[PDB]
XYZ file of C-alpha atoms in Angstrom:
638
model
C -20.602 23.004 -24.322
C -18.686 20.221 -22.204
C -21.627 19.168 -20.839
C -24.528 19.878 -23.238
C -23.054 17.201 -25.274
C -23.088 14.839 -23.204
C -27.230 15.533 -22.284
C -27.757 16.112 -26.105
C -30.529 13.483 -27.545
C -33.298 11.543 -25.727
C -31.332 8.581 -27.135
C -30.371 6.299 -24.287
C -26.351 6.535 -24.126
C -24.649 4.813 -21.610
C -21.622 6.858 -20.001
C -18.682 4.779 -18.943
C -16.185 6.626 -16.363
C -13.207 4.543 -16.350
C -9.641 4.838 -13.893
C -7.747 4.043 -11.475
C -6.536 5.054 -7.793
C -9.115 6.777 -5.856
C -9.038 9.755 -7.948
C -12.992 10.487 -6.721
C -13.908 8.502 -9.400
C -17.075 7.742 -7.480
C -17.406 11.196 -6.586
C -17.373 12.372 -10.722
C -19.646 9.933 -11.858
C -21.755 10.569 -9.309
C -21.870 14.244 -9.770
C -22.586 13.385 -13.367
C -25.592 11.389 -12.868
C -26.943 14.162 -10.641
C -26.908 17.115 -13.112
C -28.209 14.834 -15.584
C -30.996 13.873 -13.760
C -31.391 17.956 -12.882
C -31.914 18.000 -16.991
C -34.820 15.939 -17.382
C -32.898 12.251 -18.253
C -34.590 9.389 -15.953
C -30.978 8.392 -15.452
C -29.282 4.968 -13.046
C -25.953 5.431 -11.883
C -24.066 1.926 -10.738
C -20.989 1.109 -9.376
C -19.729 -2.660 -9.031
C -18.318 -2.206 -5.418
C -18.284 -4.606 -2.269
C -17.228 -1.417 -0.377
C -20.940 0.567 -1.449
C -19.466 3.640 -2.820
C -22.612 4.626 -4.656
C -24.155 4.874 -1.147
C -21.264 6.927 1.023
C -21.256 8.630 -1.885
C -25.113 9.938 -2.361
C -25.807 9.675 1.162
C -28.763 6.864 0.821
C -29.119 3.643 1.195
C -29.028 2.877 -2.740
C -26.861 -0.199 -1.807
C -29.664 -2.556 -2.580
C -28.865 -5.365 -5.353
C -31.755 -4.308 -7.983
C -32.167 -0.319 -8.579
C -33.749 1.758 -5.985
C -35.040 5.203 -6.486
C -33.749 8.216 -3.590
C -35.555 9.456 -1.088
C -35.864 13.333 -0.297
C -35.444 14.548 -3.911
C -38.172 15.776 -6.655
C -34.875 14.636 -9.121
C -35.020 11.734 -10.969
C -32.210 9.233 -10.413
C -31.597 5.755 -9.421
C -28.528 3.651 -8.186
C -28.008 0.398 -8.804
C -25.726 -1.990 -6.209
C -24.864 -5.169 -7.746
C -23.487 -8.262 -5.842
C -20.311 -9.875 -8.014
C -20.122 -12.761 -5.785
C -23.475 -13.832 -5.259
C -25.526 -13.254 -7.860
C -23.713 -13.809 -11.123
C -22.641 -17.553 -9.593
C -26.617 -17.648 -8.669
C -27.637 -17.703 -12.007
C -24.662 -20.117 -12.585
C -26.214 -22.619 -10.227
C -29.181 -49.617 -15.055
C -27.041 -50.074 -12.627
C -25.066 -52.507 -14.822
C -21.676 -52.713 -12.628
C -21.040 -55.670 -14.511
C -17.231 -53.291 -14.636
C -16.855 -54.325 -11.152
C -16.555 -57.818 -12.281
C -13.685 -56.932 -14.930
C -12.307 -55.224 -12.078
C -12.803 -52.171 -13.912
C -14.231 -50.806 -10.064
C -11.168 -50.115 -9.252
C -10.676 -47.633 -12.046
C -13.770 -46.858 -12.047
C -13.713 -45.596 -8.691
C -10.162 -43.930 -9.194
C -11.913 -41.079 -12.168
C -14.954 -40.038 -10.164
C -12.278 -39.236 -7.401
C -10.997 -36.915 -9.945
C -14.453 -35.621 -9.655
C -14.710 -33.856 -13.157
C -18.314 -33.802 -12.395
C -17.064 -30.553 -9.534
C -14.782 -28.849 -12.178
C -17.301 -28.249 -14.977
C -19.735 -27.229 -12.116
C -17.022 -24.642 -11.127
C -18.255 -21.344 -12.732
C -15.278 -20.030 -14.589
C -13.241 -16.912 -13.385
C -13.982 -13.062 -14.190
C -18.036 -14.231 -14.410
C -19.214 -11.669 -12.180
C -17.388 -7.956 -13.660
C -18.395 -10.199 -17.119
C -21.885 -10.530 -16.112
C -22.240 -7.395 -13.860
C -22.634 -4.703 -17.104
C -25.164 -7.275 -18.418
C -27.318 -7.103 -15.792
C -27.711 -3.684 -15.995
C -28.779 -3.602 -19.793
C -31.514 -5.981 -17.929
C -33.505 -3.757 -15.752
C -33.329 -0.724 -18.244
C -34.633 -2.860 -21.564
C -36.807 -4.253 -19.130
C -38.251 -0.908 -17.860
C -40.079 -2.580 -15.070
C -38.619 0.201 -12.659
C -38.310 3.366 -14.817
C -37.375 3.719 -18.460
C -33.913 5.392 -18.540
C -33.159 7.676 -21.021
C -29.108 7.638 -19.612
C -26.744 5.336 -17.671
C -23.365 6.390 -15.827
C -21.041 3.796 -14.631
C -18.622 3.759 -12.230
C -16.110 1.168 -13.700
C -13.591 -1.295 -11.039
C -10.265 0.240 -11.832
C -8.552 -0.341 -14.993
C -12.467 -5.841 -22.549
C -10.367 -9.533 -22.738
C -12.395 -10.878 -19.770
C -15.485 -11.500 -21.454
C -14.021 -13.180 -24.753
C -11.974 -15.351 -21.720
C -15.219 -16.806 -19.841
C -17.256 -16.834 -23.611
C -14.466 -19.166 -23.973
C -14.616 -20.875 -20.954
C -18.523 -21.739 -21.138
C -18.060 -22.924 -24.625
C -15.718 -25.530 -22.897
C -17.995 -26.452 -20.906
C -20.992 -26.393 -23.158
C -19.083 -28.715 -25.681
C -18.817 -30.949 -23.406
C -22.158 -31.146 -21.972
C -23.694 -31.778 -25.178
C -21.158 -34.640 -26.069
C -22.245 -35.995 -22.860
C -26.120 -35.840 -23.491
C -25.728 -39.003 -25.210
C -23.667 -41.016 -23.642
C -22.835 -44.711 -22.009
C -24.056 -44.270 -18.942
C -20.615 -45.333 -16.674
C -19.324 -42.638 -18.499
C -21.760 -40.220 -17.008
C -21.335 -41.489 -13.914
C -17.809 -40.047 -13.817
C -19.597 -36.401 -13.966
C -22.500 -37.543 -12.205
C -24.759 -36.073 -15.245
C -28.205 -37.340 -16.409
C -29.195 -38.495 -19.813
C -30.646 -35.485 -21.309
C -28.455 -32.237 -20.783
C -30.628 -30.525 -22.676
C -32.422 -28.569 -19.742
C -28.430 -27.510 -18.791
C -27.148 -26.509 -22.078
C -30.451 -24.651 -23.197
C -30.188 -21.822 -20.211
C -25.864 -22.182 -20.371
C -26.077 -20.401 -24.024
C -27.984 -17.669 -23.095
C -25.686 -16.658 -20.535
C -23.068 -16.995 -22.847
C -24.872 -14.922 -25.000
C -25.192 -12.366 -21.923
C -21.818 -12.174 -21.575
C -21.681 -11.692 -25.336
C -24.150 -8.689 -26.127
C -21.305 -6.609 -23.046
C -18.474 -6.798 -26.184
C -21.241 -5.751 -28.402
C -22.599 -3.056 -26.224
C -18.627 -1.275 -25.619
C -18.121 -1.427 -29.235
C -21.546 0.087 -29.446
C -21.137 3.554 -31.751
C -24.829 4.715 -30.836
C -25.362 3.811 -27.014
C -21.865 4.125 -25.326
C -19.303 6.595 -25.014
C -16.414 6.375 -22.625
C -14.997 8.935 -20.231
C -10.991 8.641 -18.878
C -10.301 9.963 -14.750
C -6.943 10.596 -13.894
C -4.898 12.612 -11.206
C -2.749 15.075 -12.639
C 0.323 12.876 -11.461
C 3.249 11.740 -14.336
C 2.268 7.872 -13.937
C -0.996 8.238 -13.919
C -0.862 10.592 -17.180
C 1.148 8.102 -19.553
C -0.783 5.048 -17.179
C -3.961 6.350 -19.384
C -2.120 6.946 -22.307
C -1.977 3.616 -22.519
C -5.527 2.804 -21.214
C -6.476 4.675 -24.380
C -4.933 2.864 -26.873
C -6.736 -0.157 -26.128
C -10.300 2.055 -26.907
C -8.873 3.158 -30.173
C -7.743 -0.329 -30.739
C -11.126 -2.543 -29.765
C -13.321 0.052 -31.176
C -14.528 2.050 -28.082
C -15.827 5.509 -28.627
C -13.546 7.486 -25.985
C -14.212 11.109 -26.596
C -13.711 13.036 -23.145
C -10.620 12.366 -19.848
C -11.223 14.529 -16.792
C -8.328 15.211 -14.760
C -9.472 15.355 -10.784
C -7.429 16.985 -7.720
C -6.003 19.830 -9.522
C -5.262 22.245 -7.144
C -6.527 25.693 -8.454
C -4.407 29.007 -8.019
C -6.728 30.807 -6.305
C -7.814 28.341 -3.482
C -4.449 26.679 -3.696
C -3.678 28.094 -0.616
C -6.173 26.356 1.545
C -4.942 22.793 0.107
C -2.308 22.945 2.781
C -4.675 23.847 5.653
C -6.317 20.568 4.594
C -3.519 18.322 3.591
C -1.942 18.897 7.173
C -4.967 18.267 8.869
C -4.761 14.632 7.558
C -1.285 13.996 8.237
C -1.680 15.644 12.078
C -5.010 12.570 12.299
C -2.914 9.890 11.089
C 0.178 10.024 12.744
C -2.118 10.671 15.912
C -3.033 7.245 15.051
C -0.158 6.118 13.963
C 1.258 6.415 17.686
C -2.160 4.900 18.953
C -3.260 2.494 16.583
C -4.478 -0.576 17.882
C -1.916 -3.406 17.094
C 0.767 -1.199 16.041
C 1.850 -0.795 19.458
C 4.734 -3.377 19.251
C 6.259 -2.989 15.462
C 8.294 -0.442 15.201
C 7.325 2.552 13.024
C 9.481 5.280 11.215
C 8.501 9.038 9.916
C 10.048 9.582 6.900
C 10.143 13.831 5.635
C 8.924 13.492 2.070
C 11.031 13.606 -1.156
C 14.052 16.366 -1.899
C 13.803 15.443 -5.249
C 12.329 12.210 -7.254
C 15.100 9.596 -6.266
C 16.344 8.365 -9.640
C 20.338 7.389 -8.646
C 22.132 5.275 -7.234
C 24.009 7.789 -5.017
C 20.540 9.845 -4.146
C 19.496 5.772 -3.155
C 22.330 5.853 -0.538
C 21.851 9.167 1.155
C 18.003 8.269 1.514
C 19.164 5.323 3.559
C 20.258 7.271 5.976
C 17.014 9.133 6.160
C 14.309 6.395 7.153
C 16.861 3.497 8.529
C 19.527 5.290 10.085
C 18.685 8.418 12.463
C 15.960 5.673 13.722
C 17.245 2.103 14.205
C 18.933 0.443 11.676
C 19.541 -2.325 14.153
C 17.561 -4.622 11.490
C 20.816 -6.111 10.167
C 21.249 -7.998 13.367
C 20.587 -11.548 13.403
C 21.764 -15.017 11.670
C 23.430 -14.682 8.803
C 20.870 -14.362 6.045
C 17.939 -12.429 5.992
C 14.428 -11.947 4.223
C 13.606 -8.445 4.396
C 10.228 -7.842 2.189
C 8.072 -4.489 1.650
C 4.712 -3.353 0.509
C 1.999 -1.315 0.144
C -0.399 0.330 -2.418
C 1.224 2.293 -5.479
C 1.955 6.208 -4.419
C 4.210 5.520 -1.643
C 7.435 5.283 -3.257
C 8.211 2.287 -1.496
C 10.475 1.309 -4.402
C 12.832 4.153 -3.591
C 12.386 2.797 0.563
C 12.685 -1.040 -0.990
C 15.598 -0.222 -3.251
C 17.403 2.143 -0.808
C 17.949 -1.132 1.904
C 19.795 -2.839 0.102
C 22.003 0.132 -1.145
C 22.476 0.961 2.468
C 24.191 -2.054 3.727
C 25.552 -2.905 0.507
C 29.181 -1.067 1.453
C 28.195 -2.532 5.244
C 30.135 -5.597 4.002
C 27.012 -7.805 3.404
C 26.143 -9.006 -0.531
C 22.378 -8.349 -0.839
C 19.841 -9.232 -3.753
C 17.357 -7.144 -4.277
C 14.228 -8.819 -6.169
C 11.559 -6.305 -7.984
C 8.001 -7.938 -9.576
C 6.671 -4.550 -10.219
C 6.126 -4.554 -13.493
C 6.087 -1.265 -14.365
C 9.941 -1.371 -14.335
C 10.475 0.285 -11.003
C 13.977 -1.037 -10.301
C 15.316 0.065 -13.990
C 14.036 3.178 -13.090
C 14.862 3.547 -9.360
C 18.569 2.929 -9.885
C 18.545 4.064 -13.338
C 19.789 0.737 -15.184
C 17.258 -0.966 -17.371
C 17.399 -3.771 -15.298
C 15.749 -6.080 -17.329
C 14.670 -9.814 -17.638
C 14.926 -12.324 -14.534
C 17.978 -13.241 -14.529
C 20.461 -11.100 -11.502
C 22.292 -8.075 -13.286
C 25.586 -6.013 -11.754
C 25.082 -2.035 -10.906
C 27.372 -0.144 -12.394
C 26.822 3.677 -11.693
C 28.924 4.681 -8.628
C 32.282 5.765 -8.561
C 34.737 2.784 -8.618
C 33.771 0.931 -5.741
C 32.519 -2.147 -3.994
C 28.732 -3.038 -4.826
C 27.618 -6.371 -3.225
C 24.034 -6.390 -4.237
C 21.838 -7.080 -7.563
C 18.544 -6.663 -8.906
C 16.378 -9.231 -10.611
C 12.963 -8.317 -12.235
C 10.280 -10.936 -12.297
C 7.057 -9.980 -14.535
C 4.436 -11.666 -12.729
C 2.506 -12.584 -14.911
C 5.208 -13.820 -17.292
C 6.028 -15.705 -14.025
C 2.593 -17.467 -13.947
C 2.459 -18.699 -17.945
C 5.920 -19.568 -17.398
C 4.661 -21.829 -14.564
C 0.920 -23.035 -16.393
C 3.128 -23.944 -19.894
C 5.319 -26.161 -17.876
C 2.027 -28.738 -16.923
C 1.446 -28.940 -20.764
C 3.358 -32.034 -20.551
C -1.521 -42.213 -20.955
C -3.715 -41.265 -19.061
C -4.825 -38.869 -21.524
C -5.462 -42.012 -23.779
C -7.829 -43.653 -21.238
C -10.534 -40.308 -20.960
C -9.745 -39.687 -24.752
C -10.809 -43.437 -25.055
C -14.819 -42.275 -24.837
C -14.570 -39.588 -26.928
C -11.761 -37.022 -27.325
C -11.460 -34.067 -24.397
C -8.230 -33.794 -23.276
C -8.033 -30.925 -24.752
C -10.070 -29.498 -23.071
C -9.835 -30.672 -19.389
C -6.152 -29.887 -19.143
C -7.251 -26.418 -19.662
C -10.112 -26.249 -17.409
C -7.678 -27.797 -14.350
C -6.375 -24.545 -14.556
C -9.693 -22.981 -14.444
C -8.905 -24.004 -10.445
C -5.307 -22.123 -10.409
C -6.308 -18.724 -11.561
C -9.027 -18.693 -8.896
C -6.494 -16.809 -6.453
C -6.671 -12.838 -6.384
C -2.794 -11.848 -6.514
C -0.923 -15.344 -6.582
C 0.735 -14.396 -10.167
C 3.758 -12.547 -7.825
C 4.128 -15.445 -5.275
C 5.150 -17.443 -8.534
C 8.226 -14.777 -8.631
C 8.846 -14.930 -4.706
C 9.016 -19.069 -5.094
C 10.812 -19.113 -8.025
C 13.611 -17.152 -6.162
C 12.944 -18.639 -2.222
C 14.447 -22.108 -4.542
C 17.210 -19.965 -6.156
C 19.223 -20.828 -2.861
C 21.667 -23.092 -4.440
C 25.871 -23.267 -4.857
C 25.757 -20.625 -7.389
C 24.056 -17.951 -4.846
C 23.996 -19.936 -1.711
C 27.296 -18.585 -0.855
C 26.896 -15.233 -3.093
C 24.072 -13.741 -1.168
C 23.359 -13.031 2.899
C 20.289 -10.880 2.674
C 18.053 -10.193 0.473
C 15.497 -7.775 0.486
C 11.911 -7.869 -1.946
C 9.805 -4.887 -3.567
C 5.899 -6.259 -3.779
C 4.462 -4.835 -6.355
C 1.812 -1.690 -5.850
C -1.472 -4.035 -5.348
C -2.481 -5.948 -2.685
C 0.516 -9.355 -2.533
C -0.013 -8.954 1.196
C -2.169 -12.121 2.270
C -3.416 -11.274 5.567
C -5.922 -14.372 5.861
C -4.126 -17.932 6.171
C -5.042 -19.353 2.452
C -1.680 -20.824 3.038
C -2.286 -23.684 3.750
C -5.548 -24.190 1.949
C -3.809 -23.053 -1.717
C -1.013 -25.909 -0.585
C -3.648 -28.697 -0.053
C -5.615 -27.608 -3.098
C -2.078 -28.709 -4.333
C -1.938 -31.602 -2.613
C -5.412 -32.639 -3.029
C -4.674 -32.646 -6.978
C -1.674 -34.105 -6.536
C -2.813 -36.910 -4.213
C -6.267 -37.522 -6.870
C -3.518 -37.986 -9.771
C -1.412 -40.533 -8.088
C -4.576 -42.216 -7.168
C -5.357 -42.497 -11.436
C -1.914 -42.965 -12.464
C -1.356 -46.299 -10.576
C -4.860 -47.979 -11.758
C -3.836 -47.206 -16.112
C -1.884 -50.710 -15.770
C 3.305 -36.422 -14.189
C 2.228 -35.928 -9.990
C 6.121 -35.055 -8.979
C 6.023 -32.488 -11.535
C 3.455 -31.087 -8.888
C 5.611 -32.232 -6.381
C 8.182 -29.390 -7.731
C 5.397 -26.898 -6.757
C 4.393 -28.515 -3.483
C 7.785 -28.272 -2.027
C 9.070 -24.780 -3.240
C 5.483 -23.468 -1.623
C 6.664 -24.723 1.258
C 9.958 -23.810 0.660
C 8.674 -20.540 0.039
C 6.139 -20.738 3.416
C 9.443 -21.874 5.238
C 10.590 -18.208 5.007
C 7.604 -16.439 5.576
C 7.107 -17.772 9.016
C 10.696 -17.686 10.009
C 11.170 -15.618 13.171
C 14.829 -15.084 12.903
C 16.156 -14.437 9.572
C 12.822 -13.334 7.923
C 10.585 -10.061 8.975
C 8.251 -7.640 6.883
C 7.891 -3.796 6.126
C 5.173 -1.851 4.798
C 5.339 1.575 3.640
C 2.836 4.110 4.036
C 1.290 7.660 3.425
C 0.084 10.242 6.329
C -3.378 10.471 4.148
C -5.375 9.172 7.153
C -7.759 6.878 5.111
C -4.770 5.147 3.836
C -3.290 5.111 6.872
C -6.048 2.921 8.810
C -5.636 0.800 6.354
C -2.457 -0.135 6.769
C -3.435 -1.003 10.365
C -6.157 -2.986 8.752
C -3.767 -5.028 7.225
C -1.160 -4.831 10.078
C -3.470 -6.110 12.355
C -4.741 -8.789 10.670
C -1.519 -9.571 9.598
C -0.110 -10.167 12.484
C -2.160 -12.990 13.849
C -2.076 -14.629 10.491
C 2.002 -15.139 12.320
C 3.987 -13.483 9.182
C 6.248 -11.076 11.357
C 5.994 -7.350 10.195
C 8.119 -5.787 12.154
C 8.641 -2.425 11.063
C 6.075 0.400 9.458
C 7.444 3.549 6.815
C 5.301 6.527 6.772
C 7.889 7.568 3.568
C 5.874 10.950 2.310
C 6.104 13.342 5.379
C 5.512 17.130 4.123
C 7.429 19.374 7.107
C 5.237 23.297 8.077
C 8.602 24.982 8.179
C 8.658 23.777 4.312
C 5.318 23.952 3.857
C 5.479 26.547 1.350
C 7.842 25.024 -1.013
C 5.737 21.468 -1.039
C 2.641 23.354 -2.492
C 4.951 25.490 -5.030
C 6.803 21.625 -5.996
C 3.279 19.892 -6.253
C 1.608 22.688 -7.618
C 4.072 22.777 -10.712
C 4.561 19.105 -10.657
C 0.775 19.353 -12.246
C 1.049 21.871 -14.885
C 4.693 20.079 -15.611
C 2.799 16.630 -16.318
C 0.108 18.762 -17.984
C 2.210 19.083 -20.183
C 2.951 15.664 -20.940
C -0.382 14.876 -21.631
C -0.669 17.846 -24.039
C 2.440 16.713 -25.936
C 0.613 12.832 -26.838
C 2.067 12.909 -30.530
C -0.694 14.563 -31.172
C -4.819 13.284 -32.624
C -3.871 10.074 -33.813
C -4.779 7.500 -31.061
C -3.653 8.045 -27.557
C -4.550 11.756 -27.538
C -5.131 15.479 -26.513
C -9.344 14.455 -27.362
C -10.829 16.717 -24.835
C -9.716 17.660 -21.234
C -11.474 18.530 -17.935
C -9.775 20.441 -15.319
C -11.525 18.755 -11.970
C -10.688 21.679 -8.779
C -8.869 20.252 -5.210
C -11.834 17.926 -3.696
C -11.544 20.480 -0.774
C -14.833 19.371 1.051
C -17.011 16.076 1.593
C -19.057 15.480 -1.219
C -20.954 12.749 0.515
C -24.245 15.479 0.326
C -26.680 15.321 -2.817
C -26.484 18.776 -3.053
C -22.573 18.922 -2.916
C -22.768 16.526 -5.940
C -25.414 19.564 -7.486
C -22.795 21.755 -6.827
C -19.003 19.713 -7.759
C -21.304 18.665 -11.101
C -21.780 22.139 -11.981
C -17.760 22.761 -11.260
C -16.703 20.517 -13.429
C -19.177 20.045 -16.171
């Protein structure tokens, strides 16, 4: 059976449900630890979420950081919350100046400004989701609460991050122990003591913590792996590609599960329900708090998949033209960007304005840093590399715009190569770590959540320059599907972070007898802020579904948003389904499943990324915030 296999042994093996997209996710994993619990396994279920999933999702407060047991059940399970932010950093956590007199206090006082003593206390990046799986293995080896006989994860959506901050303690631990012995000026630059041997002997064992998670996924015995996908065609060849990393690094994956199929049956009451949610949101939509003064537009959802360049054109007349279009007013250049989460086709919104008043008369760049090659898709081009590219499908005539892709993150180690480039001599001059402190500045510019993209907006915001200066008069961006939009004023507090380095650099640099290298990035930030605050020639769009959850959410952000000062003026609701049509959106959707079924069924076969074994998951038609519900959609599916 599906599921007798996966309750076969009393030997502890730890399922892993791993995807992306709010594809119930939670709501699979959770059912899973139910109906194992229902067959004798003392089982934990945990979920790494800020948002408590694990609780909304079982309907108890399991949301507390160590493993509680449920109320109200004679079933044996247990949820586990666990804090990224706070407890993973918790765990993290004579006077000879006789210098002074060879005026060495002036340099003296010049390094511990640097204040390198700060950035090896500065607990690298990714700890947390490194140390979070660790944790668990804790309480479970430990048995202080229950011994477990099976574990079910709920993964964060979509193996390197553990091998990156093992390599980022070592850093730090070399230098700690080069610094137990040490002149002691020279530890007075990191403010460290003589012996560092109480620091060093607790910093290895959580590098060997984050150590025994790459042993435990590789793990033949204990861990198995389990894909969740919507039956959509990005999503399928999305985890094609999520399983060639497991076959790669090891990872037993033996089972996907494909959730929200709608069934033939009961496929008929998937429109009573979609509607339902479309009827709430746009109900809010008129009535949202904030929303009152942007202006908002109800686009009817998709004919068919827009994949031309003439299909591009007649869709501009669809969102921007029966409704105002009155946009293009203004000065004579203008910043037009749009976002929102990936589903909303906002690509095919983004790449349809500048289509649209292309043959208006105005010459209009359109920038793309999805990297999922949206643009060479949406017009059908292969619009490829940064630099801009012509648009060649129409019939002969004038095409003033052009599309230039920027990989993010080929846009950030572009940017971190360029400060590889005397003062090196001078810290080298104690012992040799260079090396190693140029890298772990940086540990301080990876920090930020999505900054990889604003690399690709700033490197273009420059681009204004004789050879496009007069070419281009608006310009129009396509955020990637994640979460660019900034809706809390870290502005200013990234830019003095800039400053603040740059300032501390000039302040060693004049005292060894470079900074306007950062001086390039402090002005095209602020060349870059110049446009995002710019009332006249520069306003925002963000594209939207009627799913009502989704929907509130892009209030959440409009709101906030808004006092931040960025102006969003305009809202796109782009995937409207119409009654009178009603019937021939469930027959599309219905066969745009089975047709991406297919897809999936035709993965060159065995080898790697595969046909391994599927799970049909039925339309998530009711709430399955109820312990029983979870009884029941467990016994559904598995």
């Amino acid at each position: 059976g599906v599921f007798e296999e996966l309750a076969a042994g009393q030997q502890r093996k730890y399922i892993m449900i791993s995807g992306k997209g709010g594809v119930g996710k939670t709501s699979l994993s959770a059912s899973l630890a139910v109906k194992l619990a229902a067959a004798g396994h003392t089982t934990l279920v945990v979920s790494t979420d800020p948002a408590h999933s694990l609780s909304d999702s079982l309907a108890q407060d399991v949301s507390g950081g160590r493993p509680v047991l449920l109320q109200g059940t004679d079933l044996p399970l247990w949820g586990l919350e666990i804090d990224p932010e706070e407890a993973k950093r918790e765990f993290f956590e004579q006077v000879s100046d006789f210098m002074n007199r060879m005026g060495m206090g002036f340099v003296i006082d010049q390094l511990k400004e640097l204040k390198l003593g700060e950035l090896l206390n500065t607990p690298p990046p990714g700890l947390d989701e490194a140390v979070a799986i660790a944790k668990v293995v804790q309480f479970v080896q430990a048995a202080e609460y229950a011994r477990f006989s099976r574990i079910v994860f709920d993964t964060a959506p979509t193996l390197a991050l553990p091998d990156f901050v093992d390599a980022s303690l070592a850093k730090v631990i070399r230098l700690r122990k080069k610094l137990n012995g040490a002149t002691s000026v020279v530890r007075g630059l990191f403010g460290a003591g003589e012996s560092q041997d109480e620091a060093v002997e607790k910093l290895e064992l959580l590098q060997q913590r984050v150590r025994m998670v790459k042993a435990l996924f590789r793990d033949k015995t204990q861990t198995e792996f389990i894909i969740a996908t919507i039956p959509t065609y990005l999503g399928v060849n999305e985890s094609s590609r999520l399983l060639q990393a497991l076959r790669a690094e090891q990872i037993p994956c033996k089972r996907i599960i494909v959730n929200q199929i709608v069934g033939p049956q009961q496929g008929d009451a998937y429109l009573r329900m979609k509607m339902k949610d479309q009827i709430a949101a746009l109900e809010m939509v008129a009535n949202d708090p904030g929303l009152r003064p942007l202006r908002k537009v109800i686009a009817p959802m998709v004919d068919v998949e827009v994949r031309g360049v003439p299909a591009l054109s007649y869709f501009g007349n669809v969102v921007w033209k029966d409704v105002y279009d009155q946009m293009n007013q203004g000065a004579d250049r203008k910043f037009f960007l749009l976002g929102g989460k990936g589903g909303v086709g906002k690509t095919s919104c983004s790449s349809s304005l500048a289509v649209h008043f292309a043959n208006d008369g105005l010459p209009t760049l359109v920038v793309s840093t999805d990297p999922a090659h949206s643009l060479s898709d949406a017009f059908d081009q292969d619009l490829s590399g940064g630099s801009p590219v012509k648009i060649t499908s129409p019939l002969g005539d004038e095409l003033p715009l052009w599309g230039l892709q920027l990989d993010p993150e080929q846009a950030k180690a572009e940017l971190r190569a360029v400060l590889a480039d005397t003062l090196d001599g001078l810290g080298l001059g104690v012992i040799s770590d260079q090396l190693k402190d140029l890298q772990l500045g940086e540990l301080l510019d990876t920090p930020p959540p999505g900054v990889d993209e604003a690399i690709a907006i700033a490197k273009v915001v420059q681009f204004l320059k004789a050879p496009e200066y007069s070419h281009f008069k608006r310009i129009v961006f396509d955020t990637a599907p994640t979460g660019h939009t900034l809706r809390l004023l870290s502005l200013p507090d990234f830019l003095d972070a800039s400053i603040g380095k740059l300032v501390r650099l000039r302040q060693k640099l004049s005292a060894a007898t470079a900074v306007k290298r950062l001086e390039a990035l402090q002005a095209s930030m602020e060349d870059a802020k110049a446009m995002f605050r710019n009332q006249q020639t520069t306003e925002f769009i963000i594209v939207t579904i009627p799913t009502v959850m989704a929907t509130a959410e892009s209030c959440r952000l409009a709101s906030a948003l808004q006092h931040e000062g960025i102006p969003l003026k305009t809202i796109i609701v782009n995937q409207v389904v119409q009654a009178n049509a009603t019937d021939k959106f469930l027959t599309a959707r219905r066969a745009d499943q089975a047709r991406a079924l297919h897809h999936l069924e035709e993965d060159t076969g065995p080898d790697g990324l595969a046909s391994l074994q599927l799970i049909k998951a039925p339309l998530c038609d009711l709430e399955v915030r109820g312990v029983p519900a979870l009884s029941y959609f467990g016994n559904v599916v598995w």
